[PDB]
Design an enzyme around this catalytic site. Structure first.
Site, PDB file in Angstrom:
ATOM      1  N   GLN A 149       0.868  -1.201   0.000  1.00  0.00           N
ATOM      2  CA  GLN A 149       0.000   0.000   0.000  1.00  0.00           C
ATOM      3  C   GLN A 149       0.885   1.224   0.000  1.00  0.00           C
ATOM      4  O   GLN A 149       0.570   2.264  -0.620  1.00  0.00           O
ATOM      5  CB  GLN A 149      -0.981   0.006   1.169  1.00  0.00           C
ATOM      6  CG  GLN A 149      -1.880   1.225   1.201  1.00  0.00           C
ATOM      7  CD  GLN A 149      -2.766   1.260   2.431  1.00  0.00           C
ATOM      8  OE1 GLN A 149      -2.349   0.895   3.514  1.00  0.00           O
ATOM      9  NE2 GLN A 149      -3.986   1.708   2.262  1.00  0.00           N
ATOM     10  N   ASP A 191       2.266   1.380  -3.560  1.00  0.00           N
ATOM     11  CA  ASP A 191       1.173   1.956  -4.393  1.00  0.00           C
ATOM     12  C   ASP A 191       1.169   3.446  -4.192  1.00  0.00           C
ATOM     13  O   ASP A 191       1.107   4.236  -5.167  1.00  0.00           O
ATOM     14  CB  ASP A 191      -0.197   1.374  -4.037  1.00  0.00           C
ATOM     15  CG  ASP A 191      -1.301   1.895  -4.912  1.00  0.00           C
ATOM     16  OD1 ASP A 191      -1.651   3.073  -4.752  1.00  0.00           O
ATOM     17  OD2 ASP A 191      -1.922   1.122  -5.694  1.00  0.00           O
ATOM     18  N   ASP A 233       3.378   5.604  -3.176  1.00  0.00           N
ATOM     19  CA  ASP A 233       4.539   6.288  -3.799  1.00  0.00           C
ATOM     20  C   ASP A 233       4.305   6.523  -5.316  1.00  0.00           C
ATOM     21  O   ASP A 233       4.759   7.510  -5.885  1.00  0.00           O
ATOM     22  CB  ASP A 233       5.801   5.421  -3.556  1.00  0.00           C
ATOM     23  CG  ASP A 233       7.120   6.109  -3.979  1.00  0.00           C
ATOM     24  OD1 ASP A 233       7.266   6.561  -5.145  1.00  0.00           O
ATOM     25  OD2 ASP A 233       8.056   6.125  -3.144  1.00  0.00           O
ATOM     26  N   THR A 263       4.571  11.320  -8.004  1.00  0.00           N
ATOM     27  CA  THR A 263       5.595  10.923  -8.965  1.00  0.00           C
ATOM     28  C   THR A 263       5.627   9.470  -9.287  1.00  0.00           C
ATOM     29  O   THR A 263       5.640   8.658  -8.366  1.00  0.00           O
ATOM     30  CB  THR A 263       6.964  11.306  -8.455  1.00  0.00           C
ATOM     31  OG1 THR A 263       7.278  10.538  -7.306  1.00  0.00           O
ATOM     32  CG2 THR A 263       7.012  12.835  -8.132  1.00  0.00           C
ATOM     33  N   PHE A 306       8.110   7.742 -10.284  1.00  0.00           N
ATOM     34  CA  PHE A 306       9.375   7.114  -9.922  1.00  0.00           C
ATOM     35  C   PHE A 306       9.428   6.751  -8.441  1.00  0.00           C
ATOM     36  O   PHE A 306       9.384   7.629  -7.579  1.00  0.00           O
ATOM     37  CB  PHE A 306      10.548   8.029 -10.281  1.00  0.00           C
ATOM     38  CG  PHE A 306      10.485   8.576 -11.678  1.00  0.00           C
ATOM     39  CD1 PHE A 306      10.070   9.876 -11.908  1.00  0.00           C
ATOM     40  CD2 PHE A 306      10.842   7.789 -12.760  1.00  0.00           C
ATOM     41  CE1 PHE A 306      10.011  10.383 -13.192  1.00  0.00           C
ATOM     42  CE2 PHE A 306      10.786   8.290 -14.047  1.00  0.00           C
ATOM     43  CZ  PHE A 306      10.370   9.589 -14.264  1.00  0.00           C
ATOM     44  N   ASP A 315      10.207   7.014  -5.554  1.00  0.00           N
ATOM     45  CA  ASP A 315      11.111   7.915  -4.846  1.00  0.00           C
ATOM     46  C   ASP A 315      10.500   8.481  -3.567  1.00  0.00           C
ATOM     47  O   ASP A 315      10.413   9.698  -3.398  1.00  0.00           O
ATOM     48  CB  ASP A 315      11.554   9.057  -5.765  1.00  0.00           C
ATOM     49  CG  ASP A 315      10.391   9.907  -6.239  1.00  0.00           C
ATOM     50  OD1 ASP A 315       9.242   9.619  -5.844  1.00  0.00           O
ATOM     51  OD2 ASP A 315      10.627  10.863  -7.007  1.00  0.00           O
ATOM     52  N   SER A 320       8.009   9.560  -2.453  1.00  0.00           N
ATOM     53  CA  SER A 320       7.313  10.807  -2.611  1.00  0.00           C
ATOM     54  C   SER A 320       6.191  10.853  -1.592  1.00  0.00           C
ATOM     55  O   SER A 320       5.724  11.959  -1.209  1.00  0.00           O
ATOM     56  CB  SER A 320       6.749  10.994  -4.020  1.00  0.00           C
ATOM     57  OG  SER A 320       6.215   9.803  -4.563  1.00  0.00           O
ATOM     58  N   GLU A 339      -5.539   6.894   6.053  1.00  0.00           N
ATOM     59  CA  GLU A 339      -6.654   6.050   5.700  1.00  0.00           C
ATOM     60  C   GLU A 339      -6.839   4.887   6.675  1.00  0.00           C
ATOM     61  O   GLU A 339      -7.956   4.532   6.998  1.00  0.00           O
ATOM     62  CB  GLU A 339      -6.545   5.506   4.260  1.00  0.00           C
ATOM     63  CG  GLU A 339      -7.779   4.672   3.871  1.00  0.00           C
ATOM     64  CD  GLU A 339      -7.480   3.203   3.819  1.00  0.00           C
ATOM     65  OE1 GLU A 339      -6.295   2.855   3.982  1.00  0.00           O
ATOM     66  OE2 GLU A 339      -8.416   2.390   3.609  1.00  0.00           O
ATOM     67  N   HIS A 363      -6.110  -5.149  -2.063  1.00  0.00           N
ATOM     68  CA  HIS A 363      -7.359  -5.111  -1.372  1.00  0.00           C
ATOM     69  C   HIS A 363      -7.838  -6.525  -0.992  1.00  0.00           C
ATOM     70  O   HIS A 363      -8.526  -6.649  -0.047  1.00  0.00           O
ATOM     71  CB  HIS A 363      -8.393  -4.282  -2.184  1.00  0.00           C
ATOM     72  CG  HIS A 363      -8.013  -2.813  -2.334  1.00  0.00           C
ATOM     73  ND1 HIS A 363      -8.594  -1.978  -3.269  1.00  0.00           N
ATOM     74  CD2 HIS A 363      -7.107  -2.057  -1.673  1.00  0.00           C
ATOM     75  CE1 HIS A 363      -8.056  -0.764  -3.163  1.00  0.00           C
ATOM     76  NE2 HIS A 363      -7.140  -0.774  -2.196  1.00  0.00           N
TER      77      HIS A 363
HETATM   78  C1  HEM Z   1      -8.577   1.048   3.513  1.00  0.00           C
HETATM   79  C2  HEM Z   1      -7.642   0.541   2.433  1.00  0.00           C
HETATM   80  C3  HEM Z   1      -6.679  -0.425   2.568  1.00  0.00           C
HETATM   81  C4  HEM Z   1      -6.269  -1.263   3.726  1.00  0.00           C
HETATM   82  C5  HEM Z   1      -6.883  -1.277   4.902  1.00  0.00           C
HETATM   83  C6  HEM Z   1      -6.042  -0.523   1.233  1.00  0.00           C
HETATM   84  C7  HEM Z   1      -5.012  -1.388   0.923  1.00  0.00           C
HETATM   85  C8  HEM Z   1      -4.309  -1.367  -0.301  1.00  0.00           C
HETATM   86  C9  HEM Z   1      -3.245  -2.206  -0.579  1.00  0.00           C
HETATM   87  C10 HEM Z   1      -2.708  -3.197   0.434  1.00  0.00           C
HETATM   88  C11 HEM Z   1      -2.789  -1.925  -1.865  1.00  0.00           C
HETATM   89  C12 HEM Z   1      -1.717  -2.576  -2.606  1.00  0.00           C
HETATM   90  C13 HEM Z   1      -1.100  -3.738  -2.247  1.00  0.00           C
HETATM   91  C14 HEM Z   1      -3.680  -0.917  -2.383  1.00  0.00           C
HETATM   92  C15 HEM Z   1      -3.577  -0.321  -3.606  1.00  0.00           C
HETATM   93  C16 HEM Z   1      -4.446   0.698  -4.036  1.00  0.00           C
HETATM   94  N1  HEM Z   1      -5.571   1.132  -3.394  1.00  0.00           N
HETATM   95 FE1  HEM Z   1      -6.099   0.711  -1.595  1.00  0.00          FE
HETATM   96  N2  HEM Z   1      -6.652   0.309   0.406  1.00  0.00           N
HETATM   97  C17 HEM Z   1      -7.588   0.993   1.074  1.00  0.00           C
HETATM   98  C18 HEM Z   1      -8.431   1.985   0.537  1.00  0.00           C
HETATM   99  C19 HEM Z   1      -8.374   2.473  -0.756  1.00  0.00           C
HETATM  100  C20 HEM Z   1      -9.190   3.530  -1.266  1.00  0.00           C
HETATM  101  C21 HEM Z   1     -10.259   4.260  -0.566  1.00  0.00           C
HETATM  102  C22 HEM Z   1      -8.808   3.802  -2.534  1.00  0.00           C
HETATM  103  C23 HEM Z   1      -9.411   4.859  -3.469  1.00  0.00           C
HETATM  104  C24 HEM Z   1     -10.492   4.176  -4.272  1.00  0.00           C
HETATM  105  C25 HEM Z   1     -11.158   4.880  -5.455  1.00  0.00           C
HETATM  106  O1  HEM Z   1     -11.062   4.452  -6.642  1.00  0.00           O
HETATM  107  O2  HEM Z   1     -11.947   5.828  -5.274  1.00  0.00           O
HETATM  108  C26 HEM Z   1      -7.766   2.873  -2.805  1.00  0.00           C
HETATM  109  C27 HEM Z   1      -7.104   2.901  -3.977  1.00  0.00           C
HETATM  110  C28 HEM Z   1      -6.015   2.107  -4.151  1.00  0.00           C
HETATM  111  C29 HEM Z   1      -5.213   2.275  -5.390  1.00  0.00           C
HETATM  112  C30 HEM Z   1      -5.476   3.278  -6.505  1.00  0.00           C
HETATM  113  C31 HEM Z   1      -4.691   4.553  -6.071  1.00  0.00           C
HETATM  114  C32 HEM Z   1      -4.601   5.617  -7.135  1.00  0.00           C
HETATM  115  O3  HEM Z   1      -3.784   5.511  -8.131  1.00  0.00           O
HETATM  116  O4  HEM Z   1      -5.345   6.631  -7.002  1.00  0.00           O
HETATM  117  C33 HEM Z   1      -4.233   1.378  -5.308  1.00  0.00           C
HETATM  118  C34 HEM Z   1      -3.144   1.149  -6.330  1.00  0.00           C
HETATM  119  N3  HEM Z   1      -7.510   2.088  -1.730  1.00  0.00           N
HETATM  120  N4  HEM Z   1      -4.596  -0.657  -1.403  1.00  0.00           N
HETATM  121 CA   LIG Z   2       6.823   8.483  -6.356  1.00  0.00          CA
END
Ligand code: HEM
Ligand SMILES: [Ca+2]
Ligand SMILES: *[C@@H]1O[C@H](CO)[C@@H](O[C@@H]2O[C@H](CO)[C@@H](O[C@@H]3O[C@H](CO)[C@@H](O)[C@H](O)[C@@H]3O)[C@H](O)[C@H]2NC(C)=O)[C@H](O)[C@H]1NC(C)=O
Ligand SMILES: *[C@@H]1O[C@H](CO)[C@@H](O[C@@H]2O[C@H](CO)[C@@H](O[C@H]3O[C@H](CO)[C@@H](O)[C@H](O)[C@@H]3O)[C@H](O)[C@H]2NC(C)=O)[C@H](O)[C@H]1NC(C)=O
Ligand SMILES: *[C@@H]1O[C@H](CO)[C@@H](O[C@@H]2O[C@H](CO)[C@@H](O)[C@H](O)[C@H]2NC(C)=O)[C@H](O)[C@H]1NC(C)=O
Ligand SMILES: *[C@@H]1O[C@H](CO)[C@@H](O[C@@H]2O[C@H](CO)[C@@H](O)[C@H](O)[C@H]2NC(C)=O)[C@H](O)[C@H]1NC(C)=O
EC number: 1.11.1.7
Length: 595
Positions: free
Chosen positions: A105, A108, A110, A184, A186, A188, A190, A258, A351
């Site tokens: 998470q 993600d 970053d 970003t 990369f 990094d 961020s 979150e 998720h």
């Molecule tokens: C609460 C939330 C989590 C845990 C208790 C949780 C967990 C993760 C993990 C473990 C991820 C990767 C291994 C991961 C990736 C991404 N999530 Fe998620 N997540 C929780 C809650 C949310 C919520 C809220 C969002 C936004 C949803 C939307 O579409 O409106 C969410 C997104 C993401 C996401 C997209 C991020 C982006 O580029 O904007 C992941 C790549 N997660 N989560």
């Molecule tokens: Ca970054």
């Protein structure tokens, strides 16, 4: 035809060539095209976007518009029928620590964030959307299907606002709508430093020339730092328990609160910056405040990378690791480092790895207190359990000694997230992350499942029997067919996640491919990759190669017993050893011998 122009909302600044530090925004990484992999720009399209009207409407917007001649099923209805399950017994990844879920998470965060469109604070696109469930403009509400229990207690819908897009954030009408990555691309750190100047500085301690990040001056943790609190009111961390009045944290990334274990890892990062800066001034007492910040920040960035590619990706991919991320061969500027729109859904495999409860454990790793284990939902936007419960320390022990959820074709996403999600502008623990993810796939113009199968060189099942074969699951296939009526219409998030979990990995083949490919480019198209000749000295690189999350725990908590391989499933005391046995980061090689 084609359109190269559009990049209007961007301040295009100088690139101090040869600079030895990344910018905050990510500009100037790539020299030919220095906006590449910078924040606040349009995510990459590996595959042309797919909207109902060709341009911007997410399939499912118009009831009289099929996809390939079939209506797309309601997102909540796919959630209810496929994603949900009752029995949390038996759903504990035997060979993955809870840290495994949590790092993902972090990584993600970053890499990508596509912020909700915001045309109104005091504007009734929010209220009318929430109250009356009328789809329009950026209101794309998630409607309950007949027989939904939330119908009985929650209304006709769950609100949902469409993601921000470039050019303008009012409507457009030439090219396909392209959503923004605000962070970003990369890897990094961020998420720690921020991806914009305004924040990166606000995050800094510019009261003193030690290169330190700003720390909480209200609360402390056995003299260990907490992150500062945030300005924003209304605060959702405050709204969570209006009695305790503990607000959210302020980090380089807005989502840091979150959930409590995310906010914890953020703690497991700010601390280290300051540790690293202090140790660095001590050694190089002539270094700037700026210089100390940049060189820590560089080392931290290098830590995120190494943990990710050395410890994390091998166990999240498996067999496919070598097939998409061959050992490093240097910086390649022809590589696109941008986060793709599909990756932001593919990475949401995480998720299905979130279990229903979080534990606080004491120093014998036994429950900490009478309420050691909590439902995950009571922990969305919850700082107060950190500030006024125990430390960070019990939570970090839980991160080590408890397990991730194992994804399971019959038990995909815990109801803690599938029914109890808390949004920060909506007053209930009543949302569905799975529904949301499906809706967002459509919001973002995602091509369907078989388009991605085809992209990755995999078979494209057409017939319910063929889908059973790919997903080695008659009953799952059947529900998918019953709902989508053709695998071509199956939404990427659920399709990718429905595939059995590779070998030694925790994603299916479609996902391994989407993820591997994105991380390869993240690694090959970064000029400041830690292992790129020039970025660090050979010496420096001999020190960085010994970093470990274990070591991060030791140096920034009062945990003195950790496993050696923190991502795997580990039980105390057998799999634990003392911090003495655990390699240190040796900064001798950072000694500024300008003489
Ligand atoms: C609460 C939330 C989590 C845990 C208790 C949780 C967990 C993760 C993990 C473990 C991820 C990767 C291994 C991961 C990736 C991404 N999530 Fe998620 N997540 C929780 C809650 C949310 C919520 C809220 C969002 C936004 C949803 C939307 O579409 O409106 C969410 C997104 C993401 C996401 C997209 C991020 C982006 O580029 O904007 C992941 C790549 N997660 N989560
Ligand atoms: Ca970054
Ligand atoms: C649980 O998953 C772990 C990983 O979390 C599994 O073991 C991992 O498998 C790799 C093989 O790719 C092993 O690494 C290898 O070890 C040698 C030294 O013996 C070393 O030269 C290399 O690093 C090599 O890749 C290692 O066993 C392990 N990796 C890590 C980082 O822990 C393991 O099979 C699973 N555990 C159980 C109990 O099933
Ligand atoms: C809102 O946050 C409150 C903390 O800010 C929390 O209450 C806290 O939790 C319990 C409730 O009794 C107390 O723990 C112990 O407190 C003393 C020990 O010194 C004992 O007398 C009690 O028996 C108890 O074991 C905290 O002190 C308490 N603080 C306050 C002011 O009540 C609430 O439970 C939180 N509420 C929600 C809805 O999340
Ligand atoms: C910025 O750094 C300064 C200098 O360290 C901080 O001032 C110190 O604060 C600590 C507690 O946080 C105390 O020991 C003293 O108040 C100061 N120490 C020394 C050695 O001077 C200040 O707290 C930091 N400011 C913020 C907002 O984080
Ligand atoms: C950097 O990566 C790119 C991948 O796009 C490589 O460029 C391709 O290389 C193959 C084989 O040489 C050619 O068939 C392609 O047509 C090339 N395309 C372009 C745009 O160059 C490039 O070779 C890689 N460079 C290094 C040094 O590894």
């Amino acid at each position: 035809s084609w359109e190269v122009g559009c990049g209007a909302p961007v301040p295009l600044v100088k690139c101090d060539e040869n600079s030895p530090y990344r910018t905050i925004t990510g500009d100037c990484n790539n020299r030919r095209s220095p906006a590449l992999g910078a924040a606040n720009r349009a995510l990459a399209r590996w595959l042309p976007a797919e909207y109902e009207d060709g341009l911007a409407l997410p399939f499912g917007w118009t009831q009289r518009k099929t996809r390939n001649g079939f209506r797309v099923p309601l997102a909540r209805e796919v959630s209810n029928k496929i994603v949900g399950y009752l029995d949390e017994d038996g759903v504990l990844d035997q060979n993955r620590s809870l840290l495994f879920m949590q790092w993902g998470q972090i990584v993600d965060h970053d890499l990508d964030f596509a912020p909700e469109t915001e045309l109104g604070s005091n504007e009734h696109s929010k209220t009318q959307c929430e109250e009356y469930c009328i789809q329009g403009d950026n209101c794309f509400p998630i409607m309950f299907p007949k027989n939904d229990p939330k119908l009985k207690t929650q209304g006709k819908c769950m609100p949902f606002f469409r993601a921000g897009f470039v050019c303008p954030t009012p409507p457009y009408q030439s090219l396909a709508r392209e959503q923004i990555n605000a962070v970003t691309s990369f890897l990094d750190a961020s998420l720690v430093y921020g991806s914009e100047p305004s924040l990166a500085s606000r995050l800094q301690n510019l009261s003193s020339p030690l290169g330190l990040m700003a720390v909480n001056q209200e609360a402390w943790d056995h003299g260990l730092a907490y992150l500062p609190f945030n300005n924003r009111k209304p605060s959702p961390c405050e709204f969570i328990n209006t009695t305790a009045r503990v607000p959210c944290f302020l980090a380089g990334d807005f989502r840091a609160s979150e959930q409590i274990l995310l906010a914890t890892a953020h703690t497991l990062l700010l601390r280290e910056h300051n540790r690293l800066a202090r140790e660095l001034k001590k050694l190089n007492p002539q270094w700037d405040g700026e210089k100390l910040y940049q060189e820590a920040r560089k080392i931290l960035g290098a830590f995120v990378q190494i943990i990710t590619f050395r410890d994390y990706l091998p166990i999240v991919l498996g067999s496919e690791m070598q097939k998409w991320i061959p050992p490093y061969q240097g910086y390649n500027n022809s590589v696109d480092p941008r986060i793709s729109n599909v990756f932001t859904f593919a990475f949401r495999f995480g998720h299905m790895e979130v279990p229903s409860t979080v534990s606080r454990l004491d120093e014998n790793y036994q429950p900490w207190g009478p309420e050691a284990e909590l439902p995950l939902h009571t922990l969305f936007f919850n700082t107060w359990r950190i500030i006024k419960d125990g430390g960070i320390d019990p939570l970090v022990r839980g991160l080590l000694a408890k397990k991730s959820k194992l994804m399971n074709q019959d038990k995909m996403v815990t109801s803690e997230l599938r029914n109890k999600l808390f949004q920060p502008t909506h007053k209930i623990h009543g949302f569905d992350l799975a529904a949301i993810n499906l809706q967002r796939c459509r919001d973002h113009g995602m091509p369907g499942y078989n388009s991605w199968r085809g992209f990755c060189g995999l078979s494209q099942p057409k017939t319910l029997k063929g889908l059973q074969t790919v997903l080695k699951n008659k009953i799952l296939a059947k529900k998918l067919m019953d709902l989508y009526k053709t695998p071509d219409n199956i939404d990427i998030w659920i399709g990718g996640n429905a595939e059995p979990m590779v070998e030694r990995g925790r994603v299916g083949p479609l996902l391994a491919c989407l993820l591997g490919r994105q991380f390869q480019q993240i690694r090959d198209g970064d000029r400041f990759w830690w292992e790129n000749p020039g970025v660090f000295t050979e010496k420096q690189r001999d020190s960085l190669q010994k970093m470990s999350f274990s070591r991060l725990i030791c140096d920034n908590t009062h945990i003195t017993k950790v496993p050696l391989h923190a991502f795997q499933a580990n039980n105390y005391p057998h799999d634990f050893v003392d911090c003495s046995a655990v390699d240190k980061l040796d900064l001798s090689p950072w000694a500024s011998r300008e003489n």
